Amino acid sequence: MNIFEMLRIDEGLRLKIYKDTEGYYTIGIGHLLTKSPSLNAAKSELDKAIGRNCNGVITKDEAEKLFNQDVDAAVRGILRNAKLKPVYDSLDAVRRCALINMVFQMGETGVAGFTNSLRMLQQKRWDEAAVNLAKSRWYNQTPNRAKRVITTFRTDTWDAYKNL
């Protein structure tokens, strides 16, 4: 399994504008369009993003294009972030995927706020970090996904996605 397969299990694929678990306007593979309540503002962002008049609908192709860009941006942002970089560098491949997954869902900023857990991942205290990560809004709001990610950090294997 790789980062793209992992995220695609967690995010799913929708070719029509839809609402986040959060109520936000999204499309494709977890590509957030706007936090604004107007379907019109979301439509506008979409067309801006794709470079065409979409009318709220995209092709598989366009979805995957946005996905490649979003993954690329997540990694780069990790790399540019003074708090994320050292953690990422300290981790092995599988675990790096788990961090990337968090960044994709919650943004650089969001994850950089998990100070204590980051410290614990850096120290390679897997069990301790899994307990701390669970004490969050994140886990309470999207428990099945948080659990898969947390398992990955804990175990260093892809078994949580084995099932899925």
Side-chain angles (χ1 to χ4, degrees):
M1 174 126 296
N2 53 60
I3 191 56
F4 290 93
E5 293 173 349
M6 188 198 204
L7 278 165
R8 113 137 262 208
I9 279 158
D10 284 333
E11 296 294 352
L13 174 60
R14 311 238 229 314
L15 305 174
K16 190 96 220 282
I17 290 189
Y18 71 92
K19 290 191 197 188
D20 256 64
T21 299
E22 252 160 90
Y24 308 129
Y25 284 130
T26 305
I27 201 161
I29 304 142
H31 184 80
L32 173 83
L33 292 156
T34 182
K35 287 189 193 186
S36 158
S38 0
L39 207 230
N40 288 304
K43 254 99 111 53
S44 157
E45 280 303 304
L46 175 68
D47 286 356
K48 174 167 55 90
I50 295 313
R52 80 182 181 59
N53 251 68
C54 307
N55 177 42
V57 63
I58 65 171
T59 61
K60 196 167 169 146
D61 234 73
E62 283 169 346
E64 299 176 318
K65 181 190 273 72
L66 294 176
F67 190 38
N68 282 150
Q69 295 166 179
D70 301 343
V71 178
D72 187 64
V75 176
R76 278 173 326 171
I78 278 165
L79 307 170
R80 280 195 279 87
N81 192 290
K83 271 109 189 222
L84 300 178
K85 193 206 203 313
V87 185
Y88 189 87
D89 283 346
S90 76
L91 301 169
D92 61 268
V94 176
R95 297 183 163 100
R96 284 172 173 172
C97 291
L99 185 69
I100 292 173
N101 192 129
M102 296 179 65
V103 172
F104 187 95
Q105 180 182 5
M106 80 198 3
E108 242 211 21
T109 296
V111 180
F114 282 47
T115 301
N116 299 315
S117 317
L118 293 177
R119 217 248 268 84
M120 287 168 221
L121 291 164
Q122 242 209 108
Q123 288 165 184
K124 314 197 174 284
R125 307 168 160 223
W126 321 118
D127 286 88
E128 301 85 313
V131 158
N132 194 263
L133 276 172
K135 248 84 147 218
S136 53
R137 175 183 199 271
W138 169 60
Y139 184 87
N140 284 108
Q141 250 13 255
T142 46
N144 293 142
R145 175 185 190 153
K147 92 216 340 159
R148 285 194 286 279
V149 169
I150 288 165
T151 287
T152 305
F153 274 136
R154 210 184 338 98
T155 79
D156 208 34
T157 72
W158 290 109
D159 297 348
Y161 292 85
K162 240 18 145 191
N163 302 307
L164 282 22

